[PDB]
């Protein structure tokens, strides 16, 4: 057999091999130097058209000869030297040089290739444009480049709900030209969102079909009933036709997904909310945490869709009110914009009010998000939770939001050495980014605001007042024992510092 270079030569010189040539002249010469056979030569010698003898000469020649020699050493002798010169020049531009073209560009407009065709067919969503988060989308692309060599690997683009992960993944595969074409041949982007136990098999069923050729989508069988070992095998089968393929698994909830992904030796990008699913994978696991939109990125995000920036002080304060409330969160920020109607700071503060006295439901709007409101999202994040963690979370209402507070200061409201509290609050921040860990000065956690007004209008109206009371109780129990600064242990006895918000919470439950 030949190879990619020599067949690139036999393919490249076809416009040429048609204007002047005939395989019969060479048949004897190939019947001779022992690289053909008199039936091969029979097949090529009695053929009506010359295009026949040529197509058979070029098919037939490639199996018998160890190389493309006895075809250069022929176009020479036959006064067809204008051919053998092109081919010897090319063989020189490959035998004599360790450099050619690499995977890059020489037939331009990858703009309809990589952008249009491959993204669309791999079901990659239409990347966002009016704002791009540099750092994160960039690190995704980088960390994807570093791994394109690898045979299988997990990249976990994990964050809060509506924190913007999928969009960032949309952009990281839509910006560059490297990831698709240079680093990976194809893209398969599939939304999971599986909760049932039958969902994790169906997913890889639609992978298996994302793979299958345009031919035989018609032939699609009643594949719904066939074992898992077989669906797995049919995929790693149909995966032969797919050299270096990238997999985006948008919105993973079950670690069973990840297990199949790790049995099928796949290359995976993963947007998810729960980070611990990676313990399912024993492997090169790399992580990228989608933090909350910093106050300045929030500005950028606002400016980006045409929102007027403050002047008076109690307007920049109004907007820091909005940014504080929606504790840096893309989605609810967007809903906020879509619902800011006249665009005035005035109607913005209207919303700033509406948010405290009606929770997230006050700004719920039609948004690019699959969800009417972030509460619909967090819903699931709360359902999946260990029953005990569902409890701890359910009680963490009665804290102060956007305040760093001690573990013991938490031991008062949270159910069951009470380090166990920390363990729950850990599971709780890892699995939907519902809390917030901060190691020193003292092991302390923190509850943000979005993650609070979720729970406000969501936990049992009684349990609010009960957590408030169970706190004022153990606080005073602790009493019977006798800013960038943590609350000291001489002063835990009075959570009254946060009386303001405590008085509001109280008015909520007690009516």
């Amino acid at each position: 057999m030949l190879c990619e270079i020599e067949c690139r030569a036999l393919s490249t010189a076809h416009t040429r091999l048609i204007h002047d040539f005939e395989p019969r002249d060479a048949l004897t010469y190939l019947e001779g130097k022992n690289i053909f056979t008199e039936d091969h030569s029979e097949l090529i010698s009695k053929m009506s058209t010359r295009l026949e003898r040529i197509a058979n000469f070029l098919r037939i020649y490639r199996r018998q000869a160890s190389e493309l020699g006895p075809l250069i050493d022929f176009f020479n002798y036959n006064n067809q030297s204008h051919l053998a010169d092109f081919l010897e020049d090319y063989i020189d531009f490959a035998i004599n040089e360790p450099d050619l073209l690499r995977p890059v560009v020489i037939a331009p407009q990858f703009s309809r290739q990589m952008l249009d065709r491959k993204l669309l067919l791999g079901n990659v969503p239409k990347q966002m444009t009016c704002y791009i988060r540099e750092y994160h989308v960039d690190r995704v692309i980088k960390k994807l480049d570093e791994m394109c060599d690898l045979d299988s690997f997990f990249l976990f683009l994990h964050g809060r709900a509506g924190s913007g992960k999928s969009v960032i993944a949309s952009q990281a595969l839509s910006k560059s030209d490297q990831l698709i074409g240079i680093n990976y041949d194809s893209i398969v982007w599939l939304k999971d969102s599986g909760t049932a136990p039958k969902s994790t098999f169906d997913l890889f069923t639609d992978i298996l079909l994302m793979l299958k050729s345009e031919d035989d989508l018609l032939n699609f069988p009643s594949v719904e009933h066939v074992t898992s070992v077989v669906l797995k095998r049919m995929i790693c089968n149909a995966l032969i036709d797919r050299p270096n393929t990238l997999f985006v698994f948008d919105d993973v909830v079950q670690e069973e997904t990840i297990r199949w992904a790790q049995e099928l030796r796949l290359r995976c990008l993963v947007t998810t909310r729960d980070v611990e699913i990676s313990n399912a994978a024993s492997q090169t696991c790399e992580f990228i945490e989608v933090t909350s939109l910093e106050i300045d990125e929030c500005y950028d995000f606002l400016e980006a869709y045409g929102m007027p920036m403050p002047v008076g002080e109690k307007e920049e304060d109004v907007l820091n009110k909005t940014i504080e409330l929606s504790s840096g969160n893309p989605a609810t920020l967007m809903m906020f914009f879509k619902s800011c109607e006249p665009k005035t700071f005035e109607k913005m503060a209207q919303l700033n009010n509406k948010l405290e006295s009606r929770g997230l439901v006050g700004v719920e709007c039609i948004t690019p998000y699959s969800y009417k409101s972030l509460a619909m999202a967090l819903q699931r994040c709360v359902e999946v939770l260990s029953d005990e963690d569902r409890s701890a979370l359910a009680f963490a209402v009665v804290m102060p939001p956007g305040v760093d507070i001690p573990v013991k200061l938490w031991s008062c409201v949270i159910p069951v050495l009470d380090d166990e509290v920390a363990d729950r609050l850990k599971r709780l921040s890892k699995r939907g980014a519902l809390l917030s860990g901060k190691r020193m000065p003292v092991l302390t956690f923190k509850i943000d605001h979005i993650i609070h007004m979720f729970l406000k209008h969501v936990v049992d109206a009684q349990t609010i007042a009960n957590g408030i009371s169970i706190l004022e109780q153990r606080l005073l129990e602790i009493g019977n024992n006798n800013e960038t600064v943590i609350r000291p242990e001489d002063f835990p006895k009075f959570m009254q510092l946060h009386q303001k918000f405590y008085d509001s919470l109280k008015n909520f439950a007690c009516c």
Binding site: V382, E383, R390, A394, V458, V459, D460
Partner: peptide, 5 residues
């Protein structure tokens, strides 16, 4: 707890 989660 949790009115329909």
């Amino acid at each position: 707890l949790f009115n329909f989660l």
